[PDB]
DNA sequence: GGATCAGCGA
DNA sequence: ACGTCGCTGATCCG
């Protein structure tokens, strides 16, 4: 039923009040330099709809905006903030974000628009976004009066949902988690995205050059070794032209056939010199398309920068997400892939990249929550549990543990505390089930207080229906009561990982809050560029490095006081690769 | 277009 | 039965 609003053809005084619901509509999925299709304003004085072309020229409207004393209630404020940034317009004053509010109250709700968020509060006087602009090869902006009626309903929806959403947060002890943590971070992530990272494009290209070379040269050998013309990309083909054309053993099977995962071609290599050229050719493939081109595809022409979008209310545990491109999955494990980081450089001349980590954080975080005597005492002794477990998964001595090695021991360590079964472990470090099984018993012999944790957090979820993080981020687990054994089991493994994965994500979020607050009150040219789950990557002039090497680690270790010490590793250099 | 698959990261 | 949490490129298939 037509909600009455005045389609404004000019701005006015009564629509620039010190509190209003705002909507700077960015239909485009990727808001980087995306046009603004419309504006809407609800405030005690009424409901208005301003046309972008208009309002974004009006200095009185542009002022009310950039004015932090003029309050704005919104949904996905970063989406608008970044879009405006690219227009030279500053957006301050956002005191409430409906999107992040619904995320804290229940990340499983999967809110992708105001309607979905509103529905969560028995408010449905608003249409879902997909209904208004559609999707697929049809997607478009409805005509003036349709776009208008919707933007005003979304704004009106935001106007009314603030109270309901804030109260439940208040009762859930998440009001501060919203206002003092999630909302502050949204402005910082906007800067990081708008700032973007510089891309050594010339190099990156001269990389794709040779790749194609070492590709076909490893593609024909494949047709040779196989003796035909199958496409290395069809697992169905890799299955037949393998175990059924080329007769090899099946050590594992998929829900369609038999695994051709790398953890198989590996074990099934010596049975033919084709399984080796497939391992290498697939690596060069991935690294070729999913990166060289994949990155250059998002590199803007002028600034030569890429601008990731840090999705803040997407993951179910509190972690951030990155897309177009995913800068949280840049190669680093092997040497070939790692060099691509030499393509990531400082944004200004004579600057440096400063990357800071967090030493075995989830393990430290588990130590604090689980409170196992020996896991804490160990850290209080400053040991590297990854290297140690490596000393076993290889029986070697501390001095004989390699970077490559510490990785598997690391994956084993988390595999073990987060559910892993003797079979899962057995296939990982490629051993027997009886060995893996006993290695896990001794693990919990080393950390009994932790065993007790895997057992009570399962009961905790079973009783409350939700797990929680250090900073009060909660995760509902209704499948914990499932009568299906595997639904219940996945639920239980979530109750074991979410509190830990989530608390670690809360801490890197708070550290980020202290880091911007510090860099600002000390006024430095340095700023954050990326967040990689438990690592921050800043860029600054060479002259600030000496102050960074102390301020960046100190801020991160201070964020929260655990029963164990936090510890940061940090390095810097001319490129992302150099920063080590 | 979607459903698996592949491979990369934390 | 199944460690957790993500994103992107490639090809099978109506
Ligand atoms: N196989 C993995 C790898 C990582 N993580 C989680 C736990 C780690 O603590 C966190 C950060 O990833 P890192 O690679 O930084 O691992 P740590 O931080 O634990 O090790 P490092 O001492 O190298 O920082 O991500 C996990 O659950 N399972
Ligand atoms: Mg890391
Ligand atoms: Mn780390």
């Amino acid at each position: 039923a037509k909600m009455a609003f005045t389609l404004a053809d000019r701005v006015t005084e009564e629509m620039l009040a010190d509190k209003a619901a705002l909507v700077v509509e960015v239909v485009e999925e990727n808001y980087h330099a995306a046009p603004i299709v419309g504006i809407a304003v609800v405030n005690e004085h009424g409901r208005f709809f301003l046309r972008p072309e208009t309002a974004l020229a009006d200095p009185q409207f542009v002022a009310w905006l950039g004015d932090e004393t003029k309050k704005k209630s919104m949904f996905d404020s970063k989406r608008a903030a970044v879009a405006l940034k690219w227009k030279g317009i500053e957006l301050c004053g956002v005191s409430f974000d409906l999107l992040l509010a619904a995320y804290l109250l229940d990340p499983a709700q999967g809110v992708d628009d105001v309607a979905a968020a509103a529905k969560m509060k028995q408010y449905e006087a608003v249409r879902p976004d997909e209904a208004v602009y559609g999707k697929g090869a049809k997607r478009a902006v409805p005509d003036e009066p349709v776009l208008a009626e919707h933007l005003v309903r979304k704004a009106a929806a935001i106007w009314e949902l603030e109270r309901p959403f804030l109260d439940e947060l208040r009762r859930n002890e998440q009001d501060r988690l919203l206002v003092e943590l999630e909302q502050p971070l949204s402005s910082i992530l906007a800067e990081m995205e708008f700032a973007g990272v510089k891309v050594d494009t010339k190099r990156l290209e001269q990389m794709g050059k040779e790749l194609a070379e070492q590709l076909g040269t490893v593609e024909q050998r494949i047709y040779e070794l196989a003796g035909q013309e199958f496409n290395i990309n069809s697992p169905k083909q890799l299955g037949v032209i393998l175990f059924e054309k080329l007769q090899l053993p099946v050590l594992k099977k998929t829900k369609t056939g038999y695994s051709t995962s790398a953890d198989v071609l590996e074990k099934l290599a010596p049975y033919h010199e084709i399984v080796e050229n497939i391992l290498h050719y697939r690596q060069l493939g991935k690294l070729q398309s999913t990166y060289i081109e994949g990155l250059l595809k998002v590199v803007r022409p002028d600034t030569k920068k890429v601008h990731t979008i840090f999705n803040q209310a997407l993951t179910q545990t509190g972690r951030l997400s990155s897309t177009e491109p995913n800068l949280q999955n840049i190669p680093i494990r092997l040497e070939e892939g790692r060099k691509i980081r030499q393509a990531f450089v400082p944004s200004e001349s004579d600057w440096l990249i400063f990357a800071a980590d967090y030493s075995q954080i989830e393990l430290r975080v588990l130590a604090h929550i689980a409170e196992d005597d020996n896991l804490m005492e160990a850290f209080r002794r400053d040991l590297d549990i990854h290297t140690k477990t490596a000393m076993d998964i290889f029986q070697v001595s501390e001095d004989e543990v390699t970077p490559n090695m510490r990785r598997q021991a690391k994956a084993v360590n988390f595999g073990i505390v987060y559910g892993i079964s003797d079979y899962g472990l057995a296939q990982n470090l490629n051993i027997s089930r009886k060995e893996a099984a006993e290695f896990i018993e001794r693990y919990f012999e080393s950390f009994p207080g932790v065993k007790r944790y895997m057992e009570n957090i399962v009961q905790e979820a079973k009783q409350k229906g939700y797990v929680t993080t250090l900073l009060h981020r909660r995760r509902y687990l209704p499948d914990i009561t499932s009568r299906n054994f595997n639904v219940r089991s996945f639920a239980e493994r979530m109750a074991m990982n979410t509190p830990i994965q989530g608390s670690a994500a809360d801490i890197i979020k708070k550290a980020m809050i202290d880091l911007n607050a510090r860099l600002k009150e000390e006024r430095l040219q340095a700023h954050l560029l990326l967040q990689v789950h438990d690592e921050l990557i800043l860029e600054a002039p060479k002259e600030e490095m000496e102050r960074l090497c102390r301020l960046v680690p100190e801020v991160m270790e201070q964020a929260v006081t655990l029963r164990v010490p936090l510890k940061v590793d940090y390095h810097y250099g001319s490129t992302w690769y150099d920063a080590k």
Side-chain angles (χ1 to χ4, degrees), chain A residues 1 3-580:
Chain A
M3 173 174 273
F5 68 85
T6 126
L7 194 175
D9 296 296
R10 69 147 188 159
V11 185
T12 70
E13 166 61 12
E14 70 166 346
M15 51 177 86
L16 311 183
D18 32 296
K19 185 50 189 178
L22 159 66
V23 164
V24 180
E25 189 77 345
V26 174
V27 181
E28 263 190 50
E29 301 291 52
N30 197 304
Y31 52 70
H32 284 298
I36 303 165
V37 309
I39 306 305
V41 179
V42 173
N43 71 322
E44 183 261 79
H45 288 161
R47 319 208 196 79
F48 317 75
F49 175 82
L50 301 163
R51 302 202 179 72
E53 292 65 46
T54 308
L56 302 183
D58 189 290
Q60 263 48 54
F61 183 67
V62 179
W64 176 71
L65 282 192
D67 187 339
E68 182 147 59
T69 46
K70 297 291 178 295
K71 307 307 185 176
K72 299 86 173 182
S73 201
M74 309 170 76
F75 174 93
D76 196 341
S77 54
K78 176 158 72 58
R79 158 167 303 274
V82 173
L84 277 44
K85 272 178 170 65
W86 287 86
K87 305 284 185 181
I89 306 174
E90 174 179 65
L91 176 60
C92 295
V94 180
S95 57
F96 176 69
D97 195 306
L98 171 57
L99 170 64
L100 310 175
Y103 181 46
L104 295 184
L105 277 182
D106 192 48
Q109 286 304 304
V111 182
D112 26 38
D113 63 12
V114 187
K119 177 183 181 179
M120 177 181 199
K121 227 66 191 158
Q122 300 84 41
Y123 186 106
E124 313 198 323
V126 53
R127 299 164 67 201
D129 292 0
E130 191 191 303
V132 183
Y133 320 86
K135 51 146 55 188
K138 290 101 280 298
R139 196 172 192 177
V141 186
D143 269 301
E144 174 62 289
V146 183
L147 175 62
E149 158 69 339
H150 189 209
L151 296 185
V152 171
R153 284 184 176 289
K154 279 203 288 191
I158 290 169
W159 182 255
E160 312 294 343
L161 296 175
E162 192 173 355
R163 160 80 320 181
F165 271 90
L166 278 174
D167 266 347
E168 193 190 354
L169 280 166
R170 184 173 185 294
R171 296 184 297 266
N172 283 165
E173 279 195 297
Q174 302 182 304
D175 52 303
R176 302 181 68 204
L177 176 49
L178 168 56
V179 175
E180 305 159 24
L181 194 120
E182 308 300 328
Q183 280 161 181
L185 177 64
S186 177
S187 43
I188 305 176
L189 292 170
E191 284 205 326
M192 296 160 70
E193 296 176 5
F194 186 72
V197 185
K198 192 75 169 48
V199 174
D200 181 335
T201 57
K202 184 178 285 70
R203 187 197 203 83
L204 209 43
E205 298 167 303
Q206 293 181 293
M207 299 186 105
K209 285 293 200 305
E210 291 189 352
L211 272 175
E213 181 205 305
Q214 308 187 64
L215 278 170
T217 300
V218 185
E219 173 187 356
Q220 305 319 304
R221 180 67 188 297
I222 300 296
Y223 306 136
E224 190 180 305
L225 302 150
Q228 306 178 186
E229 273 293 2
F230 103 112
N231 193 198
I232 59 290
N233 293 306
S234 175
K236 170 190 66 296
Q237 287 188 52
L238 190 62
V240 181
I241 299 65
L242 201 354
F243 304 123
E244 286 176 351
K245 182 207 83 64
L246 262 174
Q247 296 297 306
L248 268 74
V250 181
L251 300 181
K252 189 179 62 172
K253 300 182 179 182
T254 64
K255 55 195 299 180
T256 50
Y258 28 55
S259 286
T260 71
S261 75
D263 277 288
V264 172
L265 295 172
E266 181 186 6
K267 305 178 180 181
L268 293 304
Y271 295 62
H272 204 313
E273 179 49 66
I274 184 177
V275 204
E276 301 201 313
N277 294 68
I278 282 182
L279 290 179
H280 182 204
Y281 170 61
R282 263 187 177 175
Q283 301 187 316
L284 288 178
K286 178 74 171 186
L287 181 160
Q288 178 72 301
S289 66
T290 311
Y291 295 97
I292 301 304
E293 310 168 302
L295 285 175
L296 299 172
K297 198 176 311 176
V298 308
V299 175
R300 294 184 71 81
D302 43 351
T303 70
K304 280 168 61 190
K305 302 186 185 185
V306 294
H307 302 260
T308 180
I309 282 188
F310 285 116
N311 308 122
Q312 198 178 336
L314 185 164
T315 70
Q316 297 308 304
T317 61
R319 284 196 180 189
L320 298 181
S321 174
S322 175
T323 55
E324 307 180 3
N326 176 356
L327 297 177
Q328 305 184 311
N329 89 328
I330 299 292
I332 185 71
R333 168 168 59 91
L334 320 175
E335 179 45 39
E336 307 77 285
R338 184 170 205 157
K339 287 172 173 288
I340 186 179
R341 299 202 175 195
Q342 301 175 191
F344 288 79
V345 306
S347 71
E348 278 295 77
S349 206
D350 298 302
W351 271 43
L352 293 166
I353 298 305
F354 186 100
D357 188 283
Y358 248 122
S359 173
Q360 319 162 71
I361 186 73
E362 292 193 14
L363 286 185
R364 288 176 192 275
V365 165
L366 166 53
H368 169 67
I369 299 188
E371 291 183 51
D372 171 39
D373 308 292
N374 317 307
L375 187 56
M376 299 191 298
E377 169 72 40
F379 286 124
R380 281 162 174 169
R381 287 192 187 184
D382 183 29
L383 306 175
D384 187 321
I385 300 303
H386 291 155
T387 288
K388 203 166 168 196
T389 297
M391 290 172 76
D392 291 63
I393 302 304
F394 302 106
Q395 214 74 280
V396 300
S397 59
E398 184 178 0
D399 325 292
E400 300 183 358
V401 174
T402 66
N404 193 60
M405 285 163 78
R406 185 167 178 284
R407 302 176 84 288
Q408 283 78 79
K410 171 186 294 198
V412 159
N413 268 318
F414 291 119
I416 294 190
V417 287
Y418 297 146
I420 205 79
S421 66
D422 52 11
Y423 281 111
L425 184 58
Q427 167 168 165
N428 185 57
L429 27 53
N430 181 65
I431 66 179
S432 71
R433 182 207 63 57
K434 174 172 175 292
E435 288 175 271
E438 286 172 39
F439 176 80
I440 284 176
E441 180 195 1
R442 308 166 194 174
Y443 195 91
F444 290 111
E445 286 179 347
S446 298
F447 311 122
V450 168
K451 172 187 178 177
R452 309 145 190 171
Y453 163 77
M454 288 174 98
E455 294 169 0
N456 323 323
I457 195 69
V458 160
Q459 287 303 305
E460 240 298 290
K462 159 188 169 189
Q463 179 181 302
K464 271 81 178 314
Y466 65 90
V467 276
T468 186
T469 71
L470 243 27
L471 306 205
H472 298 164
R473 187 186 297 278
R474 64 166 66 187
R475 188 189 195 183
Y476 293 103
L477 300 174
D479 288 7
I480 203 78
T481 70
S482 173
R483 281 303 175 68
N484 189 65
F485 274 101
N486 271 304
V487 164
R488 194 188 209 290
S489 282
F490 272 106
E492 298 187 320
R493 288 195 246 77
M494 273 173 247
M496 300 173 176
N497 169 276
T498 297
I500 319 300
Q501 155 153 162
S503 292
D506 282 347
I507 291 173
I508 185 104
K509 271 174 166 173
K510 185 175 183 297
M512 279 167 93
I513 287 169
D514 303 317
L515 180 55
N516 196 68
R518 295 297 317 191
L519 296 167
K520 271 54 194 174
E521 55 192 16
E522 202 161 301
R523 306 183 175 179
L524 309 178
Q525 287 191 271
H527 56 93
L528 282 157
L529 287 190
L530 302 174
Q531 180 263 22
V532 180
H533 307 124
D534 89 319
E535 159 169 277
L536 304 184
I537 301 175
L538 290 75
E539 57 157 39
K542 310 185 302 182
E543 302 73 8
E544 295 187 0
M545 295 304 105
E546 305 190 67
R547 243 186 311 173
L548 243 52
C549 294
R550 301 192 70 69
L551 185 50
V552 176
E554 171 73 324
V555 169
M556 290 171 76
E557 298 177 0
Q558 303 282 54
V560 304
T561 306
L562 306 183
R563 293 187 178 71
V564 304
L566 296 184
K567 183 193 174 192
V568 179
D569 304 295
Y570 67 89
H571 312 96
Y572 62 84
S574 54
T575 71
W576 196 355
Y577 180 67
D578 252 36
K580 56 182 174 58

